[PDB]
């Protein structure tokens, strides 16, 4: 009998109704048990960590690797460094993991891991020797064709270093075993970039799709939220690519442009550096560049999607739950035939059905076409590919190779979502699919066929 | 004293009397030590596979993993399930698939393994307990980098598929293992067109030589028999190149193409579907585009060489023994220049002769130039070095990049056996080197100088 | 008490000395401890080796293997068969090549090794069976992933193979476990032009940045010193980049051209054929085409460079100390404006000292700009990334591949002197950073930076 | 070739070459010379930066040595020194002797030695143990039960060898023979403690019933004792069981001398042994009963024992090394001492060695002194450490008899192997006691070069 795994029984519920809510079962009965199969994980490594603080006294911690499955790629998911840290939350994780790390065509498995060590109040020193504590253990389950842990929360290029550095003292081995990793130690230019440049090149082969190859980025006008490395980054892509960026938010206010026009690059960095010493937007309009009251208005408390007017395409990446149902329907009486989510989860509910009846609505490209975060920002995902395949060969590609095929790895990602929802979900004739409903199925049933091939269900 | 393996001692044989009948062993007699030395296996596994059949009974089979030099390379070579199988016929093959193998230049061992374990009606759950005990045992012996199968007779996608899960299960590690893989699981895109297109790009660099790169498929007619899955890519490949693809041909008989013109794509497609379906040519020229009685002429029971008038190139690509020493002489009536082998020994002992003794009294481009199977058709085998190439970093190529790099391969292919009959069976000045002769020495002298400089012999 | 390491202890100081006459104690105290903890080899393995004579008598020699740091990759650098061989010696380079290696910006560690096994008068016979003697116990401690060794004074191409096959042999794996390697068995094109080529690309990626990018090699004298290969590919390569070869020299004496024109590639070929047949250059002036007095004229006993008038390039690729102080001088009032070392240890002190006080005192492109051979010279070691990059993928790749990578290399090995200079050396505005000072400083910052990243000091 | 100077090593490979020259072995078997130049290159050594962690969290640097010298016999067997002056040099030097004293012990345990030159000098339990940790993660790459079983030496006790086992079992996941000296209920062996001190009076009793053709033993013997530690405490008691006095105790600030007749008591070797526990000294102990009492004792400050004992029949110096030299030997000879040999690892200067030797030659029969080796003599403690594998291996803990059984067994057979050795070899003169110093050396040479030849090694 099991015990209880509340987070992880939700992450299981959601993903079996989607399936149902499809042809999938009517064309393949027989994938109930690939379900039954995938969602047992292949292995759980629970271990002890002991570790000592800057007074000397013993502490405990509890470390796991959810290692759940391997068909399409050695093991490859995040560690987690939080006191919330549980079994059941990990599974939650690993679980996901599989199908969103599936949905970009990469060679990569699926799980995840860490401990309930609280990295808060703990010095420099203290995370360290836990780190060594928590690598003496992990070093056994993992390696560069096995299992290739990274970061989470918690757990950043600090920490994947301490990590690095003692599976190399152990195991006698440079190799890609760890992502996220410094870029004199086998880290990967575009990294920073990634997930920012990833939505936009999405985007861009949504465009395409709908437009047959007519139109693309250039001319068109693209309201942005947020200002850290996702907000910035995809606003440079849109800028290089001939587009506009037209606003800018933070949590205290938007900054929009007055009219027609964009963010320049130059401007771009000022925004970055002022969010690096942790200055709000407001405190930066005061003086030039942005004291120009003919090119940008400041807006206080308020997010941009009703004060930008006519825009093309939307992109959230601020926070969660940062489009509402009234701002994904001004976005639809402002022309806005594009959208995708920079942040996890940043349209709620209401504005994700109000995107999906108006494509459903609305033949072709008179439709607002929409994709979730799962499959427009897995660009951070993707590079780590990149920064592994780089491992493989020991050498270091330009800014220039890593970029254009990160583009690629998100048209397989495109192109994923694209013929699942015309195969499991089939809209009428003229209508764009649902790249929400092909993209919560698509990592299953690539996973689900690999499994088959391989004899682990039958 | 030694046992009896007549397929491994008359295979042995052929070599020695190539090698025999050349300026090898007149320069190099020490490379007699060789011969010697890499005709005894490096390594041979036997081992027992017991395994369930549905009724509940247990079942004995033999297995084998023959791993006979790995100079080049690791071992490379494919797995044959049939009842036949034995030492002997895996030392033949594996002793063969050394020297074909390391002709083409990437970095290849050579071995053989199986089974005398019958597919022949068997449940598909009889094969994956077959396939899940004989990795069982061959998984210690084997690895990316040690020794990577194949198919072969008795094992294809399904056996390759329950070979690597269980090697997954066992070993713990995503890897190149295996080849032929699934393409969602490290499979290489080309794979189905990597026979076909690899003949072609042999051709392609045979004319470039030839007429010192002042002609190419642009502008030739092409006779092609078979009209499988080699014959249809060659066909494709021919055509995209701006050659005219004159014949298609299947067991029952022949479709040419009357007068000039060529099939198109849309047709090799139509003729590929009903291939598919099992139906044989002669059913679809009932109605359009075959009824077309200006563009084809169908022929019962005929091969096409007699029949498509004068033509430039020949392909080979249906049966053993469809061109026989009437149709060599026609084909060089009709001026034919190239003639490569898609299919397996596609042409017989009299047509080769008559090839060989049209080059040898004919300087220049008045020659017919015959290039052998095990030169003209590894592109199958090239494909399994660049499935291997991606396996590495986790990354899948483009179609684009695969086909390019088939090409380059298949000029190495070329070129082992073109410079290795200058060197070794040297043509009198302005005749052309012999490649069937270049190309059954290639391997060895490769080979042998590199068991050479690892201190192999000496 | 530690023991007396002359070689090493004075290699250290030389660093520890470089070190403090820079701003990075100052910036970066803290630092000094990454000195003391680097400069204890991570790991040595010491090991008896005993191997038999043609005689069939025990021989005893003492095998080493120096494994200094793994931080920017896993180990890398060559053996040395020497009798003068101790690990005094071999931790004294070993030392030098962590640093020397993180030049490149590849993952490579550092490392050296080596026997006091003397080549000098052994057969054939005795070097394979020592190498097999000596690998049998090195093979456990390197591979793939941990240790990549090479060749030094004792070991090339020759011994390579043989420590190759005894690997092979043990561990079941073909790898890229050494460099250096048979062009049959993972070898890699460019190697012969590695140094050569290394060179000149250096010195473009300097004028470059000299010039903001107007020139290049494009129109420029370039005086060249040597006659073997290292001349002779840096000579080539000035060509194929539209500048003039103005000399080749032996250590005999010079040929120079009159006024304007250059070497050509066939001349070049002409001095190649005639320097393998070991004759000198005086002896090819009877004939033409070097007997035309009009391009060419031979000045017996000199160098070339106060005879090559004006000159913009300047390229000692011989033998050592053959730029003194006076030709420095004399280079300067030339107009020479680069200078880069492919024969290591090429400028003298004192010449070295006159190219960098001439810099000092001339703001921009006015300054006669001085490359060292560690950088300048690192085409070799770049390569054997090359290399090793290849190996992982069991696919060679074109010349031209390797060519264009080897460029890129450069680049890095420039951009880490260049910056780092512009760090930790800072020049007076519009004056050039010291190369010399910055590839001796970027090295370790490199490497101490990492280590600190990952924890193998605090 | 360049060579190192390891000068302590070079000494002790020069003087073995003698003793096995000095005799009618290589006349009778002059392929072994050849074994010479094989056996004295060490098979393997592993040297290794380990870096460390102090009370105040800042980065501390130290040198990590394994010697793997010989391994025909066994697995690489011998200890892990701590202290400053520690380097290669050093360490094969101590290697090298461990190899023919593991030998001389009969159990399949080869040769070799490790440590490093931390110096547990002022510092915590914290700081050795993380010092154990990090100086482990490296070394449990070269080691295993059937590979390398290090041990304990100075700056390496019961306490560091725990801390070492249990980052091996960490990072290899296997609990095994992996070190000796192991405490009692996690593999380690009764009568470790006591098996150096017993193993010396043990091997000393048969050199006395071979002089005296049966006649005497321990049994009325006054015996002078070096050192206060476990094998000078062990020795001692062993000899107050077997009917001898023992007439002195020492540490480094001094010696504690019997009054008279009298012996030390089990009683008063329990106090002197809990007071070096808290590591207090002799000095320190004196002043109040039972060892004020003038009349049983004298403390004699900054003085070796030897001339203060008067005269002696044994003496076992267990001290520390090289406490011993002509002059000490001179007054042993003086004192009516016939039978010496060390607890303590190489307690005999080589001029001692050459006095007691020409002392033997010269005088027929019990008038000689006579001298056991090192490697023979306190190989006690050793055998021991074969038997604990033993233990780990049956995978039983064996009683305190059982393995005392064994340890008499091992002593005796080395005692005979040594005589019987030179007696065949460097053959006496008559009533002559044969020497134990070059049989004991020929006997060892010859079990590991000639399980070296069959091997492949030499040839």
């Known amino acids: 009998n099991l015990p209880h795994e509340p987070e992880f029984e939700q992450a299981y519920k959601e993903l079996a109704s989607t399936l149902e809510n499809s042809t999938l079962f009517q064309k393949n009965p027989e994938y109930r048990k690939a379900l039954a199969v995938v969602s047992v994980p292949e292995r759980v490594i629970q ?12 502490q405990v911690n ?4 959810v290692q759940f499955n391997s068909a399409l790629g050695p093991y490859k998911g995040g560690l ?10 990990l599974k939650f994780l690993g679980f ?3 199908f969103k790390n ?13 401990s309930d060590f609280d990295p808060k109040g703990k010095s420099d020193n203290e995370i360290r020797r836990f780190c060594v504590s928590f690598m003496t253990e992990l070093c056994k389950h993992i390696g560069a064709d096995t299992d290739v842990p990274a970061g989470d929360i918690g757990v950043t290029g600090r920490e994947v270093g301490f990590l690095f550095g003692q599976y190399r003292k152990i195991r006698n081995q440079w190799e890609g075993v760890l992502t996220g990793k410094g870029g004199s130690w086998g ?30 980025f250039k001319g068109k006008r693209v309201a942005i ?13 849109v800028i290089e690519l001939g587009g506009s960026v037209v606003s800018l938010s933070d949590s205290q206010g938007s900054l929009i442009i007055n009219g027609e026009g964009s963010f320049t690059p130059e401007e771009i960095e000022l925004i970055a550096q002022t969010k690096v010493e942790r200055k709000q937007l407001a405190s930066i309009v005061g003086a030039a560049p942005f004291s120009d009251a003919n090119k940008f208005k400041y807006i206080a408390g308020a997010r941009p999607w009703v004060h930008v007017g006519k825009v093309d395409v939307a992109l959230p990446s601020a926070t969660q739950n940062e489009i509402s149902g009234e701002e994904a329907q001004v976005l639809i009486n402002a022309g806005c035939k594009f959208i995708a989510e920079g942040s996890n989860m940043g349209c709620t509910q209401e504005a994700i059905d109000t995107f999906e009846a108006h494509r459903t609505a609305n033949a072709g490209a008179a439709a607002i076409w929409y994709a979730p975060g799962k499959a427009a920002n897995a660009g951070g995902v993707a590079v780590s590919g990149l920064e592994m395949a780089q491992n493989s060969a020991r050498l270091s590609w330009t800014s220039e ?19 699942t929802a015309q195969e499991y979900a089939t809209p009428a004739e003229g209508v764009l699919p649902s790249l929400v409903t092909g993209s919560n199925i698509a990592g299953f049933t690539k996973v689900a066929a690999a499994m088959k091939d391989q004899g682990d269900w039958w």
């Not at 271990?47 to 013993?58: I, K, Q, S, T, Y």
């Not at 509890?62 to 690797?65: E, L, M, S, V, Y």
């Not at 599936?102 to 860490?114: D, E, H, I, R, Y």
Request: hydrophobic fraction near 35%; glycine fraction near 14%.
């Open 96 to 98: 996901e993991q599989i």
């Open 225 to 237: 939220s947020g200002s850290g490395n996702v907000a910035q980054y995809a606003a440079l892509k």
């Open 80 to 89: 987690r460094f939080h006191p919330s840290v549980n079994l059941s939350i």
């Open 401 to 419: 190779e890593v970029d254009a095929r990160l583009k690629d790895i998100m048209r397989d990602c495109f192109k994923n979502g694209l013929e």
């Open 62 to 65: 509890r470390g796991f690797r």
């Open 187 to 216: 880290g990967s230019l575009i990294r920073p970039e990634a997930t920012g440049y990833g939505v936009v090149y999405y985007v861009e082969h949504m465009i395409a799709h709908a437009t047959n190859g007519q139109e693309s």
């Open 47 to 58: 271990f002890r960590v002991v570790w000592e603080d800057d007074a000397g006294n013993v």
């Open 102 to 114: 599936a949905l970009t065509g990469l060679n990569m498995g699926g799980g995840k891991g860490g």
